[PDB]
């Protein structure tokens, strides 16, 4: 992705 | 020395105050966002809220038996009589939790309701020495306790991909396809301030309460061990965060087992 994502 | 810069960052929207303190510098309480205690939307999300689409239980007790259909959906009900996750709960690979809802035959005080009762732990927003604002616990938190929910603005994966300020995005599903994300940048609760830790004392769990639209789980943090009074809260942001941010800065969690330093 183009942006940082927190995730499980 | 410590200055209390807010009585309550939540303005009375939580069951207890969440004060903010600063023992580090001259900064006042952060105010560049709007505190909300429940998820919101800007653009419509079309969550399925058809009451007839809910799976529900027909329990004649307090939902602590083998026979609770909501427990069955969750694999089993993972909550003990104190609302804590059972030792058997897989923290490495958490199941989906389906709490009881308004379509169930049970009472509002049944066993299978924890996250829907909201934040109750005494938390505090504070100024850290080298990671901006962080969140600590003011009291001992036993293992498996619900601590807080990741709340913010519900957006599409596509929209999240054009949000320049990306430090507060949380993907609800890791798969490709129709996927959604909570952005806590503009609207968020205390969880927006929880820093990353490589050996975390919180784990995020996907939970369903008032609706069961699988596109829109709610994110609940549970403690993974005893959290002692004063301890900073942390969870593992995961690889989709550090894949991007690791090119810009290194992890300062301080763990001997740090994986992003
Ligand atoms: N383990 C860590 N090491 C270095 N920076 C961290 C970190 N955990 C969180 N952060 C910082 O906090 C951001 C997430 S938002 C978390 C709250 C933030 N400290 C604030 O003051 O608003 C990250 O992009 C990074 O800037
Ligand atoms: Zn039941
Ligand atoms: Zn039920
Ligand atoms: Zn019930
Ligand atoms: Zn680390």
Numbering used by the authors:
A (entry chain P): 2 to 9
B (entry chain A): 975 to 1235
Reported in the publication:
SET domain methyltransferases deposit methyl marks on specific histone tail lysine residues and play a major role in epigenetic regulation of gene transcription. HKMTs catalyze the transfer of a methyl group from the co-factor S-adenosyl-L-methionine (SAM) to a substrate lysine and, with the exception of DOT1L, are all organized around a canonical SET domain. Here we report the high-resolution crystal structures of the methyltransferase domains of GLP, G9a, SUV39H2 and PRDM2, and propose a structural mechanism for substrate recognition.
The H3K9 peptide lies in a groove formed by the I-SET and Post-SET domains, as previously observed in other HKMTs (for review), and makes extensive contact with the enzyme through both backbone and side-chain interactions. Superimposition of our six new H3K9 methyltransferase structures shows that in all cases the first β-strand is in a conformation which would preserve the pair of backbone hydrogen-bonds observed between Lys-9 substrate and strand-1 of I-SET in the GLP-peptide complex. Our structures single-out residue R-1 of H3 (the methylated lysine is used as reference position 0 for peptide residue numbering throughout the text) as the major contributor to the interaction after the substrate lysine itself, with four direct hydrogen-bonds between the arginine guanidinium group and GLP. Intriguingly, our structures of GLP in complex with mono- or di-methylated susbtrate peptides reveal that residue H3K4 is making 2 hydrogen-bonds with the D1131 and D1145 side-chains of the I-SET domain, which suggests that H3K4 methylation may lower binding affinity, and reduce H3K9 methylation efficiency. We tested this hypothesis, and observed a mild decrease of 43% in affinity of GLP for a H3K9 peptide trimethylated at lysine 4, and similar reduction in enzymatic efficiency, while Kcat was unaffected. Several aromatic residues line the GLP channel occupied by the substrate lysine leading to the catalytic site and contribute to methylation state specificity as previously noted for several other HKMTs. Second, the hydroxyl group of GLP's Y1124 (Y1067 in G9a) hydrogen-bonds to the methyl-accepting nitrogen, thereby inhibiting an orientation of the dimethyl-amine that would favor transfer of a methyl from SAM, as was previously shown for SETD7 (for review). Unlike I-SET, Post-SET is absent from the PRDM2 structure, which lacks co-crystallized SAM or SAH. (3) A more rigid conformation in which the I-SET domain closes onto the substrate peptide.
